[PDB]
């Protein structure tokens, strides 16, 4: 689906500086808008709309994959976590940026899938949700697939090969080191409870296995930076403390 | 050229969604006790369900049609007059009927349809009764799904010496239907 | 659609032989061809013999070339794998599959089988 | 009243009708729609979306991760194809499981061109040359490069561009090509061949994969809504 | 003056094409087993066939009409309520129904018509369903002809102590019909 | 609703009606027509096509090749006709088997002129003279040339032109002539006569044939669609 | 149907030269268009659209007739046979030219019938085709009728006398020595497989018997030359070899 061929190596470094935060993107070009819709409006504004970096996870030959939930992931991130927790409402878009660096000597391909309403493994259609609020919500450390989400079934009862129906990019080691996904707010309502319902599902699975020459780094790292876009919350409620 | 493949034209079919079973005993046959209650869901059959599952969300004007068939059970030469049935659509989350006797069956607010047997099968339109902007095929967060109310059916005519078995077939034609985000189909059995 | 059953599989001896066969379903074997893959336990699929139906011209893997034979009968709807001069390595999980043709290539085969195990060196 | 006359058809319920009916809830305040991204207008739109082909449905590889992995191994320069696929989107076990094929399981006919895209997933530093080839309906599966070379084909250089798109033109007899399970429907032949043999830099694992994607085109259509479910 | 001799007016007649036979036993009468399947062809009768054979090709909108007659078989004073029948047109080359039970009979995509007995005979329009630009009366090269789908009919009402025999008569009126090359007529018997 | 009143006719199925009915397959993409040569607009068009008459349906000659062969033998100058045919297109075994007659087996009436064409199939080098004659409805079959000579007739010279067309005018009582099997419907009389006696060159086989063709005209019509089949 | 009277003997010789090929027609005039439609378009063009002569057959007092199939007949003819065989598709019209010469001393009449979809003898309507691909396709040598096609039933269950419904000409020894039939492509489809389906059926039967004076040629010969017109094939497929 993502049959692109930017350049291959590295050309120019253009750093995104949104408020206090500062990413130095590989370039910046090769970004995918989900369904062709930029996030929009239906209060820390520019102060709260800044990319927060989650924890770095280790990609090794045996990795099955990883998954995250939005808003959930960024529930501990300063200004965004707060306005999220001190409001009954909240809707917001996201700029997902997944960086995966290596060399001219590694190989493989990661698929970064952004799935709306990504319910995970519990074939119990006679009842979704299932897994306790704490299990389904792993926050910033994220959850992992296994050969409890089954990788080839994208952990939801649907063969991986078709996951390309959801917006996505493929980080292919020989081409790009970054994937960029602008995801607008997707839900059945104008605005809803951020604490209870998870808007999107960031999925990253080994579409090709990792292979390094002779002896180098035994494993390589991947990073996810997520930025809230057009975030509003109603209504200035409690300020407990 | 692609008209017969558009969303409206993909679902512009009436599909069986359930088969309610009622009866008219002259005695104590309380299992049907003349009435049957059915929770309106697409999830009971499979053909309509899978067709609707290629998507996550959808708004749809729902048009039901009721075919009623009757028959005598006991090998008797006993007779019966043409019977009348009552088919009620109880709007999403309202008092659920048990006994064929109780108050609920007087439905000041809920609709009701009397169907005389032997004529053209019954038919009603229910607008997008979603509580949300869209119906959620699959739902995430913290089944009940969305809910489309319930259907209750009883024989209105009174207890006839000759017991009569009936079956109300329900058909759901979603009309003026729109959908949203698309997920890969359910490969396996449900 | 087509479900062809792997027949003739059994535990023989070193220097020995064994006949294998797969009967058609879904279609008449004659259009698609048929071949065999011996995925040695813990290693990848390993090609051995392939033959075309409506155009007989056989292809063998070099590791089993000369010794191993393959034949076909489109009338009995079965494919005949003739494994000769069998040895201790020739102990693998055998498989028959239908492809296009007649070309031992990990795949290029559609419907496979269940897996018939021929333990050549059964005696120590 | 007005003189009327009941004709044939009266009192019958035609499942496929288009008649108006009495609204069970008059004046209900329907909740208006909101523009949620990703509306779908027609089913043929879903097929134009590129989808990953499970090329290797071998006994151990079908129904798992590696069904999507085409491993450039290390075998003889024997032209024996490095993947062959019958463009019988329905009457061939592999193509039938792609979104494309899935839609192609609800109709009796299809027309138009398809496009096979391949993404090379091998260690940058490596090179070599491959040839993806097509062979119109009827012809024997081209077993030698020399043969495949004769039909419509593109030389896909690994070194240069990782991805390669090879459109399958709509070469067929009838106006609407049969999407059913026919004896030997035709039916193209997309297949890659070792134009050369893989060049490897210093000490790469020497075995890499390629993925495959299929999708319909804007000229792709379907008719006579058929079905099945169990 | 020649209007009543034009193509449309030459075929503007409804002709019997077959007589399907079904029944409603209370037991094991599996031959009809309530259902009968008929492969839609003109080739069973002779009058319509010969009229269509004066030509080689033809496009024709096909309008069917179904007359259903019923009757009790066993000399019994046994009764039965007015029965409902299901007549399905299964679009060219689709799953063929065997048992009156099986899934196929839920036809997500195929049409279906419920006919209550005692009313005006049933009627449906099927457009030119040719796979080719024209239907081939006689075909040359390397029977099945062209194919017009199949008709399945069953009694929907359930097993009634009194066995009822039924016969569905099918009538084919080709409308908005055009033809092509003309061959000499079939002199002899078919 | 609107006050309505069911009148006589309701619920009846008239085989010959012209009513609209619900379309069993909504929005089906019908395959459009292509202009294949030889469309037919009306049945009377097929009759205007010249067709070969099987003049000699004798016991051994009917139902075989020679039923179409009229052999100029070698008999007396006895005016005894060299073929007589009753223009009772239906009520005469010969005319009934031509395309013309075949259409004339599906109606109760016909009107208009017909034209009998004869193609001489004899050895160029031969000559002589023949006379094809007509005799309006009622009259006794003209048995002597002298008689046949009195009615509408053309002198057909063999030597000059091989073919000869003799149109049978529409001479009849009623507006529509009865196409049924009547006692003795009339009914022309097309018959050739030995005006002279065949001249032969050197050593030709001396026996040759003539073929006959019949066809309706643009002024030919039919009504009250009747039938039969068995 | 063909009630014409050109001249009788011979007037002027006008030779048709289409590419490499060269016929010297009796004249050229007296040609019949089938249904009043000239062949037309919906790649050896002028190189492949040239009249190829089939084998000459012997007409004798006992001849029952002959038949051929198109395209089939011309399946061995250079450029046309090739483009026919190396393509899944193919449609094309034909100029059929049947020459039958004698003298002022022979006599008889041949009927050259061009029948679309001319299925041959196998009263099995419950199944046409019947006769194996090889039998039904005799190529260039052609097939013969018998007193297996029955002459008076035009070998298809329909009395010969009516064969005049299909386009045709009658070679009558005293009038013309040639028959000319321009036949456009007739089929249920825009374009179809040439190898599988036979478009037309060239039929030649003794409508009058052959008779020669005293002693001359014991038999006379007839010839069929067929020319493809507006021939297209899709799509440049295999070039095997």
Swiss-Prot record, chains B, E:
Lineage: superkingdom: Viruses
Assembly, per entry: Interacts with capsid protein VP0, and capsid protein VP3 to form heterotrimeric protomers. Five protomers subsequently associate to form pentamers which serve as building blocks for the capsid. Interacts with capsid protein VP2, capsid protein VP3 and capsid protein VP4 following cleavage of capsid protein VP0. Interacts with human PVR.
Protein name: Capsid protein VP1
Subcellular location: Virion; Host cytoplasm
Function of the protein: Forms an icosahedral capsid of pseudo T=3 symmetry with capsid proteins VP2 and VP3. The capsid is 300 Angstroms in diameter, composed of 60 copies of each capsid protein and enclosing the viral positive strand RNA genome. Capsid protein VP1 mainly forms the vertices of the capsid. Capsid protein VP1 interacts with host cell receptor PVR to provide virion attachment to target host epithelial cells.
Endpoints of the signal sequence: none
């Amino acid at each position: 689906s993502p049959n692109i061929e930017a350049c291959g190596y590295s050309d120019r470094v253009l750093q995104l500086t949104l408020g206090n935060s500062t990413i130095t993107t590989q370039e910046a070009a090769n970004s995918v808008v989900a369904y062709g819709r930029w996030p929009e409006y239906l209060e820390p504004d520019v102060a709260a709309c800044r990319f927060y970096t989650l924890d770095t996870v280790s990609w090794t030959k045996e990795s099955r994959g990883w998954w995250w939930k939005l808003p959930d992931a960024l529930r501990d991130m300063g200004l965004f976590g707060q306005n999220m927790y001190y409001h009954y409402l909240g809707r917001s878009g996201y700029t997902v940026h997944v960086q995966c660096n290596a060399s001219k000597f590694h190989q493989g391909a990661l698929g970064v899938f952004a799935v709306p309403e990504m319910c995970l493994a519990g074939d119990s259609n006679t009842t979704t949700m299932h897994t306790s609020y704490q299990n389904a919500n792993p926050g910033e450390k994220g959850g992992t697939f296994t050969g409890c989400p089954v990788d080839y079934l994208l952990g939801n009862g649907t063969l991986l090969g078709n996951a390309f129906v959801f917006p996505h990019q493929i980080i292919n080691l020989r081409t790009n080191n970054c994937a960029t996904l602008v995801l607008p707010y997707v839900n059945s309502l104008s605005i809803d409870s951020m604490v209870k319902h998870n808007n999107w599902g960031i999925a990253i699975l080994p579409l090709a296995p990792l292979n390094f020459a002779s002896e180098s780094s035994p494993e390589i790292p991947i990073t996810l930076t997520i930025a809230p876009m057009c975030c509003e919350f109603n209504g200035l409620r409690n300020i407990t403390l | 050229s692609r008209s017969e493949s558009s969303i409206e034209s993909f679902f512009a079919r009436g599909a069986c969604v359930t088969i309610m079973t009622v009866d008219n005993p002259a005695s104590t046959t309380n299992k049907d006790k003349l009435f049957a209650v059915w929770k309106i869901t697409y999830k009971d059959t499979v053909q309509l369900r899978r067709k609707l599952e290629f998507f996550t969300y959808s708004r749809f004007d729902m048009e039901l049609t009721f075919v009623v068939t009757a028959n005598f059970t006991e090998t008797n030469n006993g007779h019966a007059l043409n019977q009348v049935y009552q088919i009620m659509y109880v709007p999403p989350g309202a008092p659920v009927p048990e006994k064929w006797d109780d108050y609920t069956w007087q439905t000041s607010s809920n609709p009701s349809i009397f169907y005389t047997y032997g004529t053209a099968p019954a038919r009603i339109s229910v607008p997008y009764v979603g509580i949300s902007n869209a119906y959620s095929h699959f739902y995430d967060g913290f089944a009940s799904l969305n809910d489309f109310g319930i259907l209750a059916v009883r024989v209105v005519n009174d207890h006839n010496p000759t017991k009569v078995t009936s079956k109300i077939r329900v058909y759901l034609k979603p009309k003026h239907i729109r959908v949203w985000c698309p997920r890969p189909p359910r490969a396996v059995a449900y | 659609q087509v479900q062809l059953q792997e027949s003739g599989g059994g535990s023989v001896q070193p220097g020995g032989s064994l006949t294998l066969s797969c009967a058609a379903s879904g279609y008449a074997v004659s259009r698609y061809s048929m071949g065999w893959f011996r995925q040695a336990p813990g290693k990848e699929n390993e090609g051995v013999a392939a033959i075309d139906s409506s155009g007989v011209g056989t292809t063998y893997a070099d590791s089993v070339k000369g010794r191993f034979t393959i034949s076909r009968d489109n009338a009995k709807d079965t494919v005949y794998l003739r494994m000769n001069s069998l040895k201790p390595e020739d102990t693998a999980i055998y498989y028959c599959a239908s492809g296009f043709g007649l070309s031992l290539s990990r795949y290029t085969y559609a419907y496979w089988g269940q897996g018939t195990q021929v333990t050549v060196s059964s005696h120590h | 009243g007005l003189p009327v006359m009941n004709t044939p058809g009266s009192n019958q319920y035609l499942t496929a009708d288009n008649f108006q009916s009495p609204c069970a809830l008059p004046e209900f305040d329907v909740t208006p729609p909101i523009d949620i991204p990703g509306e779908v207008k027609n089913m043929m739109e879903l097929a134009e979306i590129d989808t990953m082909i499970p090329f290797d449905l071998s006994a151990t590889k079908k129904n798992t991760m590696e069904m999507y992995r085409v491993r450039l191994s290390d075998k003889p320069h024997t032209d024996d194809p490095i993947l062959c696929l019958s463009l019988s989107p329905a009457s061939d076990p592999r193509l039938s499981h792609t979104m494309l094929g899935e839609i192609l399981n609800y109709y009796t006919h299809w027309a138009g061109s398809l496009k096979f895209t391949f993404l090379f997933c091998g260690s940058m530093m490596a090179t070599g040359k491959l040839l993806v080839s097509y062979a119109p309906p009827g012809a024997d599966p081209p077993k030698k490069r020399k043969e495949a070379m004769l039909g419509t084909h593109v030389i896909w250089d690994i070194g240069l561009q990782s991805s390669c798109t090879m459109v399958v033109p709509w070469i067929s007899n009838t106006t609407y090509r049969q999407t059913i399970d026919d004896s030997f429907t035709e039916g193209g032949y997309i297949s890659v061949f070792y134009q050369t043999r893989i060049v490897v830099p210093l000490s790469t694992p020497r075995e890499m994969d390629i993925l495959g994607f299929v999708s319909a085109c804007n000229d792709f259509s379907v008719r006579l809504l058929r079905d099945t479910t169990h």
